[model samples]
Each structure stands twice: as structure tokens, then as C-alpha cells.
Target: GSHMYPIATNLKVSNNQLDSYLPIRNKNNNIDWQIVTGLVLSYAVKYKIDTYSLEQFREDCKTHLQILIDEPAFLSVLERMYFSSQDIFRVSPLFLLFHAQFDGEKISAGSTADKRLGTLFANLMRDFSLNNPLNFIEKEMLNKLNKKLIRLGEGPFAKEQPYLPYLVTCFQSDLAFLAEHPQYLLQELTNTLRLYAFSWCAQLALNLDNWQDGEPQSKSLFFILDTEKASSERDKIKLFGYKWFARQSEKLFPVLSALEVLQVKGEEKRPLWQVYQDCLGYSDTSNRVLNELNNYIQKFISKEERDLPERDRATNLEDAFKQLLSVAVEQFQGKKTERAAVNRKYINELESQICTDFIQVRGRAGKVLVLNQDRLLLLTNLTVGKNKKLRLHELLRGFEQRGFYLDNQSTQMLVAFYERMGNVERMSDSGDAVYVRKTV
Candidate 1:
């Protein structure tokens, strides 16, 4: 009903061996042929295509498309992505958890067949690229993307890790492109983790010692998660850690390869604010812990970065969405009835609250605007030859029926207040007037 592209996963016990493929391949060039065959079997069973013969499987797989869609899980992830950022304390950990889980699903057991399906999809993608070559626009994009693979071939960490960043770059670009379309973010995340994980891992392995500038490591988030009590519905998410370690590499020996490990006691767990404080140069010597924490943020956020030369402002919004959705989904998961109630509250507020600028026709001339959210600016209809620059607060104070005014002191305080609340301004010039949006 809602873009329902079903992926089958109801396989027999022999099919379970698909999880071992990526890790094994990462370790050695040895292909566990028996495991590979079992995975092929799983792929068949998953799509309900019962074929024991390799020839039959190949013939049946010719038209296969590797798209996995899970409505409940997808919605759950979206909810988490949306709400996790609402809370200040939970932002980092919740974001990291959701980002990893969202990524871990693509090639993991719960979502779809990892190895056997991977080969089939790889063939399909390659064939598609070959058959439908890029047009001018696509060629332009391809030219922009032309670069040596970071963690592949003769790269620095190539011996230790192969095609890791390259894979990550592939998925990062793929997912970012997909996310821009609004409808495919959940689906893209569901099937794009293997690439994302490899990219993240590759970056860590390569950038192990480059913390001369402070950035936090991914390890700190894990430290926070591990120390917290795991006894609630939210705590059940910890189970997904097994999926990450299993589907991703077991090379957890170097939790992260960065130098200067910062230790935190179980009782005194570090908070993200302290991490931000450290980022602002709060410490004399380099705080390795904060550096590593920022590293994790940097890695997780690399998904938002463009490898090309483009002038686009960078913010933590994508990370924020992931973090927000993680918490919202966790809160709503087990408590279906409660989730419904919370959803109602959110949806109600969303519906009732007008999101756009509250506009009104200014004066009898139908020109000029009194804008007073953050900074004071006046909009005049100079084109129509009616130039009246009304002081924002003074205009608002003119009439109880028209405007409300705050004193200069209050206006200045308002700026400080909004700024303290992480306010952002959206400014646009409409002819002679300016339109600004305030977001906190």
C-alpha cells in the first residue's frame, strides 16, 4: 500500500550462514564455498524461490532487484531519526546508535540475505551501469566523482583493510542522494550499511594518529552506552550491538585506532556538553577522549559531506535527524498504545503550530513589514514609492489589534536569549525588504 517492495527472508537453518561471508572475506581471500552455497540457498528461500540447483538459482535470479523494504522497521527508524535530537543529553549517543543500526541493517540477517544476495545485486548494479551509461548530467557527476579509492588497492591501510573507504564512499553518496528525495531515506539506509560501515572503519584505520586537532572518537559513545543501565525498552537496542559486530568486521580489537585513549569511570560517565566544552579548548593538553568523540562525530557526519568542490554550508542536521529518530523509535517500539499517544501529541502540536512566518499586511499602503524575532529589520515597499521604515518593536506596539512591541532592552535580551538556545537565522531579501526565519 505504501511503496511496498517486499523482500523475503523466511529461510531454512542452513541459510543462516550468510552472516559469515563479509567477515571471512575481510580476513582472508578464502571464500567459504560451502557457506557461500548455503547463503545462495538462503537467498532463494528468502524470496520463496525454492531452487536447490545452482543453474536454477542463476536462471531465477536474472531479474532480481536488491531492494529491501520493511514497513514497521522503516517507520520505527524514521521515528527515531526525527525525535532523538529533541533532548540535549541524549543527542550524541542516541544519534550514534541509530546511525549504526540504520547502517547495520542492509547486509545484516534481520533485513535480508547478506552474502548471496550481495553477489546477485552486485551483478545487477554492474549490468545496469554498463547498459544504461551516464548521460551528460550523469557524466558531469561522474567526472566530479573521479578520484582514487581511499582504502583500496595501494592505499595506506589497503593491506590491513581493503576497499573499506571506497565502499563507504559508495554508500555515503548513494544514501545522501537517496535521502534528498524524501521518500527513499529509510529504504536506502535499510540496504546500504555494508558500504557505510566499511567507509567508517576505513577512516578510523587511516586517521588513527591524526588527532593533533581535537575530535572525539567513536569509542566514547560506546563507553556511554555500556555504562548506562540496560533494563528498559530503550535498553533492548543494545541487542543490536551483536548484529553490528556480527555483520560488520570482528576487528574490534582496535576499538578505534586513534592515539591517546581517554578513560572514563563507570560512575562518572562523560556527557556530551563536556565534550563540546573540550572542543572549545577547555583543557590545557589535548583531551584525547574529546578528540576521539569528535572523530566519531566526524565519521558519522562524513555522510553529509561532499567530496566535490561545492559551496554548501555544513551542519549537524543529518546527524541530528538520525539521533532524533533513534530515540523516538525506541520510545515508541514496545509501547504501541503509549506510542500512539505520544504520536498523537507530536502530530497534534505539529498540526496546530503554524510553521511559517506569521505575516500581516502592514499599514493602509500594503507595503513594508515589521520583523522582530531576533534582529530588528524593516521592510519597505520602495518599488511602489511608499517608503516607510517602521521600527519593528515600535510598529508592533502601535495597536493591540496590529502589532506588539518590546523595548530596546528586551529586544537585545531576546537576541541573547535566542542565541543561547542555539538559534539559527534564515534570511532572504524580498525586493527592498528582508525576510528572516528564527529557529532554535
Candidate 2:
């Protein structure tokens, strides 16, 4: 009884042509989408309005209307049908109801087109009640409308469902919420930071193939929320740390460390978003949304170097031997000074560097040394021989098979050890080089 049509009188559309507008009725013969399409077109013609542009529009109705009948439970499809027709034809509840009958009469049902149309009509009329310089009522009505949408089931809500996620996300926050009030629909869709935060969650969820070559590159929660804020710096990093990295503790090193470094350096506030925007590839350059995600990943990983304390602070073979010996003493005697114990910072830096430069273990994993094919043999022995100290020259001689002259490359190799461990030491140039434990 509450439902009524905007147009109560007929527009003099011919009965002969009306059949063309009728659709296949449901099992009970209570619906016909074709009739609704015909009514809309007839009214447009009667008003001397252009109807040719909507020829394709009518076809969209045909395709989508059938989907509604086939799957009467899908409210998202019904919502899309209402909105799309309203946009193209100024379609009103009268025409929508004319097609959806109950027991041979036009009436409402939970899954019927009439029910959906009535809801939309009431909402639209409510929106109309707010005149120029609208007050709380308009906002309240809008929020009410959003709330209703959020209660619907998961969707590609329309035939165009695949593109819907991207389209909704690309919009400004309020507008996207207007498109579909996700906050009511999804858990993480509440705010902008959550959207960006959950995007990393999506990043972690990707399989090998999709991670490498997928459309849109990465996914996040609410690309719509806080778009303007994401365009800025402080919010970006704060959200990246609190929302993204902090939530992803289960992620492995390198990937985990990469995001952490990004978060901390992002605090440096060096036009981070701008630099990221600049790094986006050709396809993503024009797409601010895609660029926002893709460029951040590209920029973070492509960073030529990170400033670590161990960087360029090479430890010689002799120094490395000393550190190794100290580690041994620490292991056995437990009486080593703080200096003798290797700086954990050094190991942290080495592991980070090795992860960045040497390994690409997206899924498969093994020891980091195996990734560095060039130094595996020499490093492996040192690593496995935790307690055994080798003669400096003898260890040097082991590298002859690497095709590098032992004499020329000994210091370079030793420096690598020193960077990884400070406990390595040589009692004399020709004597045993005391070893300790290797950095994992």
C-alpha cells in the first residue's frame, strides 16, 4: 500500500507494440522485463524526447533483467538494474512495477523487481525532499540508503561485476561509499588506512603467477577512503606502518624487512608519494589509483641502497678472525667483552643485504648462502665449521677454484666475513684464523 508510481496514467503506448517490450515471465508469469523497457521508450517518445540513444540501453535491461529472473535471490543485480535504468531513461517505479506482478497483479515481493523499485523510489523521493542548502535530513537519508546497500550479499553486483571492485575503489571516498556502502558490507572497508593496509594483505595473498603479472598489480581494501590523504606523506607511512606492516607479522624476512624499511624511511618524508608516483610505469602513470600501489612497490624495492651501519664498513680477514674467535669464546667461556660479541646490527644488515641483492625466494626457500652461487663453497665451510679455525692462507687457497687469484681476492672475501661476523681473527699472517658462528 505504501508503494505508488510516479506516472499513474498511461502514455498511450500501443498494445500491439507492448508485446515487443514483454520479457519471459517467471514460473508464475508475474514478471515481464520487456514491458518495462517498452513503457520507458513509449513515454520518451510521447514526450518528444530522443529515445534512439537508449537502444543499446534497452538491450542492457534485457540481458540484466533475465539474470534477475534466473537468480531471484541476488539483490545486487536488482540494485544495478534500478540505478542503470534510472540513469538512462529516468525510469520510475510505475514502469518497474508494471512488469513485476504478484498472482497476476502488480505487487511487491522480497525478491521481486517491484520491491526493489519501491525501495529505490522511496529513497529517491526522500533525497528530493531536501531542497537547496540541504540539512541533516539529506545526509541522513543518504546514509540510510548506504546502510541498506551494505546489508546485501557479496557481489560483483551487476553483469559488470568484474570491473566493479576497481571502479568503486577508484572513486573519491564519499563517492565510492555512495556507490556501495562497503563499510556496512565488508569488515576492512571502513576507512582509507584500512583499505591501504588490507592491500598489503592482498599482496601477501597472491600466488607466484598473479604476483608477477596481474592486472592492477596489487589489491587493497579501500582505495576510495582517504584518497586525498594517501596523496600526502605522513598519513601514507603512518598507515603503512600501523595498518600494513604491523598487521603482517607472519610475513617472512626481506619482504617483511622491506616494508619496515619503507615505513621508517617513509617517516623521512622525502616527497615519498610523489617519488612513488614518478616511478610508476607507463601503463600505471595515468592511473593514479594503480600508480599509488604499483609505484610504492616499485620505489621501495628499487631503492638502490639502504643506509646500514655495516655498509662500506668492511672487516678485514684479520678482524673477522678476531670476531670469530670472540664468538667461540663467548660460546665456550662466556667471558667475552661486549666488543668481542658481534654487533647484532651487523648481522641484521648483512641478512637484509643478502635478501635484497642475492635472493629472490618468493616461495621456495633454502639457506641464503646457496643463493649466492659465487661464494657458496667458501661461506658454507665457514658456516658449517662453527668451532674449527682454518689457516688464513689455506682458506684463501680454497677460493682458487673460483677463478679469482687467492692473493688478490683474500682481503675482499675476508671483508665479507668481517661484515657478517666480527669474531674472525688470525693469530699470525700464516697461522690459524680462529672462527666462530656464521650469521644465518
Candidate 3:
């Protein structure tokens, strides 16, 4: 095993709310996100090599790597060991594993988690060992670092942290390989820039959503990672790393795109180890609405007021609304259906507020008629609940299976509730509004 490489341990993460980490870049900017584009690019390049290995990809990596470096934002991220001229050690293997058509070469039917970690760790450990083997103090230090990555992945650290499991799982896959040797893990994990890079790239789409919203809001991206394995270990699986090679593609999109371009050989290609498919589903309903909001705005204002920001209004509003909606949805699903019903009742009980809001903003004739029926319907859906809660992956597996559709609005209500909580948390302790059940 090549030792100089970075290897991380296989970690598990359960929560996926990493957005809380986003902050304003400075006073001028309203939003800030982790920066992982260069890191994601390097992983993407490696995925290209693993999937195609064609001579063309060699050229592509050089070109793409150059592109990543030339970009100001991406170049700034390289100090974290992602986009710079520095060699990539960890995420490279994940790309190899996800795209490999042969066993031992990358991932095979026999590839145990330990074996994978072993290959990765042994490589990094060799590097450290050649330059400087672990002394007693160093050994103790590394051991502590190893524990932290794992803890941050699936253990108590992940459980306790507000970071989203979706995000942690994606990043930790590469970190797991680095964890085998305690020495390397600490050095890599402690790189705040890399974490920032990881967060930035992961939040690229999210920030775009915010830009579209023109206000503070959220955006969520979902993906699936499938392990090609023997029949016995079938159901269990792990997610991909956007920040790591397991999901990178040199082309600036993702490794999933590389897989899209790969040619699948028939007989010799083993069905076991290579990932047959990488599914990524994304939704930005809010962004779409934001772009069109200008028309809504124009109609409301007098014809003379033409200079105002019109084109981006509709798109921005929808993006803002969707982010709000996602939080609501999370709260609904995280709790029992009955609790969501209560939220629905509360909204319905306040229809007068909705009507008043409509009148004040747009006036009865213009605003009431232009009321967003979809949002109202979304509230209803949250109240009633999405009766069908089936796994989307399973539904995709068979035609006979019922179609996978979610009400989508249930979570939206939870988003609304979270906002309510923010305000409630601020009230003075003396005399905040209180509710009591009236006796019949």
C-alpha cells in the first residue's frame, strides 16, 4: 500500500442540518458558506480517471485542475489541500472505488470496510512513517484524532451536533480513509480551510438559492450511494462525498456526471463492486418563483415606478419561500403525524390573519384574487400529512411498486414553526403570550 496518502476511517452520521454553520462572509454579504469547490474538483477529476481511465481523462484532469486553480474563489480554497498543486491522497481512492470496474483495483465484492480503510491508511501511514514514524506522544495524538473523525461521523458527535447527517456523511467518507493512521487524520481534520472548502462547495447550490431568494433561506440537496456487494450484505449502504472523490467529477459538476459518460462493458464487468448508478435528485422550487416575481411586483406598483428591481423579484421570493418551506417540512416529519395536525389547525384557525395579510399587501381585488393557492394547498397538505411514507429508492426498483410522491408541504409547516420559535425564544420572560385549552 502506498503510505504517503491520506486515509480516513469509515464513519457514520445520523443528522444532516449542517446549514447552521453558514454565516455572513462579512458585513456586506448576507450569507456565508463552506468552501469545498477545489476539493470537490480534485475528487471529480479522480472520478473521471477511475470511471474512464481513457487517455482523454488524463488531459481533462489537467485542464479541469487548471480551471479550478485559475478561479479566484477556488484558488483561495487550495490552501486547504483541495485545488492547489498539492497531490490529492484521500478522495482519489473513493473515486477509484465508485468508478472501478474491476475488483482489487478499487472496490470488489470482497472489499471489507476494514480492508478499504487498511488500503487507505496503510498508504498514508507509510508516508508518515518514511518521513517521521509516530513517537509515543504523536501516537497518542493521532489516536485522539481518529476518534474525533469517527465521532463526528456517526457517533455521539454527529448525534449531538446540529450539522445535517446528509452533509457529514458525504464529507466523512473520505475522512474515514484518512483515519486509519492517527497521525494523518489529525493533520487533515484540523485544516479549518479544508472544512470551510468542503462546506463552501456543498453550499454552492445553497448560496445560489439564497442569491435567488434575495433573503435568508435554505436549500437542500439529496443523493444516494449504492455499494456493489454480494447478496448477503445487500441492503446496507453509505452516501457519497461531494467534498471527496467518491462523488467528484473533473468537469466541475460531480462524479455522477462522469458515470453518466462512462461506457459499460457487458460480460467481463463484474456486477459487484463498481457503482452501477449514482442518483442525485435536486429541487429548487423557490429559485424558479424568484425569477418570475417581477411580474407580480410590476402589477402591484403604479406604472410610473419602473426602475425598481423587477426581473429578479419573483425568482427571489420563491427561493426564499422554499427555504422556509423546507424547515417546516423537517419539523413535521421529525414528529408524529398528530403533531403536524395541530400545526394545520393553528394555521386554519388564523385564516383571518392570512386574509388580512392578503388585503394589506395587494388590496382585496388585486391581492385576494392573486393569492398563492399553492401555498394554501401546501398548508392543507401539512395538516392532512403525506399518508404515503415509502422509500423512494425502493419505489424506483420496480414498476409494480407505487409511484413515490410526497405531499411536500408537511415539512413546509415545520419551516414556518421554526420561524415562530425564533421569535418566541426572544420574548421577555415576564409576560409572553400563553395559550390554554378552554373547558367545554
Candidate 4:
């Protein structure tokens, strides 16, 4: 096995929690617009106060709210939405999304615990806040919270964050369209973004070192839908794209956790001896090695909003890290129990998240990974130029850059699917002659 990464094992993280290290959430990590909206608002408040602690934001933010009580017009609406123990409207309803209770107990929002995944979303919304479908609402609401009321200006997000560049760039570039799309709004946009978050992360975790040397590059690939062949190829398709890929993708975290035990003599990192002997360390009858792996990913949330070096990009690391973490715990424990029976837990979870409407049903071969009409349209519109077209091969290249990988067979299938959808044009018998345009 050849060494690919600069492969340092320094392992310096600001937080010591396991989930912070690589975010593989258990079953409770559902994405909600209410929750995300709350996160964005809370982060905005925190940013205004210029403090890192939520507790500090609570104390100081309330002092700012003291001005609001003197105004009755503000009082009517604030009191109706959320409750606070200090005074009738002492608790800002905006904070309720992240905080369960207010003033009296100062409860943290139960929906999003210590996890900072919301920042990823907040940063995303903040950068594109100008394009928020609810832009008029933010302005309308902010007017009420202005100087005489609450006094925090429009600076809700910090300036230095990028929205998970490696994976988010694809979607971030489409915020305008997503906002304007007939069927999409805040929640719909969030749901679509969440699905891609899962897809990009899963692809990254599975292909950590899947690039070529000399001219190294990171690549994450998936099979776009091929309805005609997906039916007959369901079994074969399920085996690789769905089953095998999901199973194999779980290794990144456990391997990263296992990285600590590897011996190193100097500061300059070694190419991480392909594999090392652990000497059967910690024969624990208690938590075992699994515990270290369970919540091993929170720092994945700390990506800067600035552009990362070309070689250093991958999944929206936080979400992908979380998915990978879930994959590992369920995977290791699942395989640990029965080497033969299928572990449908994680695979099924992946299906619901990514392949819900994208399933093939000739004989109902469970679910396999495939794109669908909605996303395919979204994909092309985003991938192709605005009011412009991409040559078929160039379009495929665009998909690859965005982490969707289709083989030649899958590629040919896409052309036919595009043909029926009526947006593809052919100049000759070759892919070079084929031009794919976004459906208007």
C-alpha cells in the first residue's frame, strides 16, 4: 500500500469530545428548518455580542433586550411566541430554537446539543443571507429588533467561514435558483442540502485516498439513475453502489481513532506504517475500543469559511464525518455480531436519506443508489452554465467535480435519460458531439 497523505498524526483539537473529532451521529441527528433557523438566529446573536460562549450571549443579549420592554408594540409579539421566567417577554423567542427554557433555568436547546453542526448551516445561510427566500422577513423582523428594541444589527454570522467548500460549493452556487425554484423554500432547500451533505460525506469517507499520485486529486463518485437498466441491474447495483460501498465507507474514523496508537519516533510524521501491531492493548471487558470510536468527531465542525487549499478539500467534513462515525459504530458492532447476516441498519438509513424517491421498482430490489428527476434537474441546471450548455463529456466532468461518479454504462444511461427528458442535443455519434443543456 502506497502512502498518499502527508499523513500527520499531531491530532490537535480544541475540544476533547469524541463527536467533535469526526461527527458520526447516532439516530437523533435529524435536520429541521425550525432548528436550523434557530441556529442561524442564535449564531447571529452570539456574533453580535462577540463572545464564544452561549452563556455569555444569554446574559449580555438579555441586557440588550432590556430596551425592548419599554416599547409596547415589541412587547405584544415577543410575549406571544416564547416564554421566559425573568419577565413576561424577557426570553427572546428567537433563542428558543436553540434553548429549551429561558432566564430562570437557562436551558440549552435540546434539539442541538453540544454539536456545532448548526454553524455549518448558519454560515451557509449567512454568506447567502442576501439570497434567503425569507430575506424580506429577516428585514421585516430585524426592523422590529432595531435600536430601540433589541439593537443587534444584521451581523449574525462571522465573516471567516466558508460553507463546507469541498461539497457545499456545488449547492452554494445555486442558492439563487434554490430560492427561486417553484417547489423550493426554506425547508425544501434545507432538506435537499441535507441529502447532498449525506451523499458528499459518504463518498468522501469511502474514498479517502482514492486519487492518483504525481497529479493527486480528491474524488467522490456515485451512480446517477438509469431507470431502464436499474431494474434488471438492481441486484448487481445494490451489491456495489449500495451495500458494499456503505459497508466499506465506515473505516475512516475507526482508522483515525486507531491512528493514536501508532508509534512515531520524531516530530516529522511518518507515512503511517501501512498497518501496525496494537499488541492486543486494552483487553477491556468494559467500554473497549468501540467507545473511543463512538462519538469521535466534533472538530469536523470547525472548517473555516475561507477557501481551503485545492488538495485539502473533501466532503462537508462535519456531516460526512458524522455519517462515517455512525457507519463505523453500527458497522463494527454489526459485523462483530454476525459475519453472515446483513446489517441493514445503516444501509437502510442511507437509503431513506439518499435514495428515497430515487429507487428502482421492477421487482422492488430494496433500494440502490441512484439520482432522480428532481435532483438530476437540479444537478444539470447547476452544473451547466447559466443559459448555456455543456458538452456531454464536459457535463460528466462537472458531475465528477461535484462528487457524483457514473461509469461508462451509467454515463450512456444518463444521455438516454436526458434524451427523453428532451434537453440533450447530438451533433454526431460521439459524446463529444453531445451537448447537454439545463431544462428551462
Off by over 4 Å in 1: 1-176, 180-188, 215-252, 255-261, 265-440
After superposing all C-alphas onto the true structure, candidate 3 shows an RMSD in angstroms of 27.2
Q: On residues 293-324, what C-alpha lDDT tens digit does candidate 4 reach at each position?
A: 22233333224411112222223323333443
**How well is each residue in 1-440 modelled by candidate 3, as lDDT tens digits?**
22211111111111222111222111122111111221222222222112233233334444455564567664344434434321332322222222222222432222232222222222222212111114442243334323321111111000112122233332333344333433343334323222323233343323322322222222222211111111221111112122221122111221111112221322111110121111011134343323333333343232453222232332343343333233323333434555345444433322221122221222221211111233222222221222222222232221111111122232333234434443222223543332111010
Please give the ranking of all candidate structures by lDDT, highest first, separated by commas.
4, 2, 1, 3
In candidate 2, what are the lDDT values of residues 1-440, reduced to their tens digit? 11221111222211111111011111122323333222221222121112222344345544545554656554454446445544322222122222322221222232333232222122212112211112442243333222222111221111111111232222222222222322221221122222222222233322111212323323321111111222233332344322342233222222222222222221221112222222233233233333233333333223342211221211332232222222222322222534223323323332342123222222232221112332333233432333254544554433321112222233444545544555455432453344433332
Q: Which prediction has the highest lDDT against the true structure? A: 4
lDDT assessment of candidate 2 = 0.27
Please state the error at residue 124 of candidate 2 in Å: 30
Give the worst 10-residue stretch by lDDT in candidate 4. Answer: 270-279
Off by over 4 Å in 3: 1-24, 27-165, 192-202, 210-440
- The Cα local distance difference test for each model comes to 0.26, 0.27, 0.26, 0.44
- State how far residue 277 of model 2 sits from its true place (Å): 12
Worst 10 residues of 2 by lDDT: 13-22
| Order of the predicted models by TM-score, top scorer first | 4, 3, 1, 2
Task: Give the per-residue Cα lDDT of candidate 1 at 168.
Answer: 27
Q: How badly does each model clash, as a count of residue pairs?
A: 23, 15, 51, 22
Q: Which candidate is the best by TM-score?
A: 4
Task: Report how far residue 139 has shifted in candidate 1, in Å.
Answer: 38
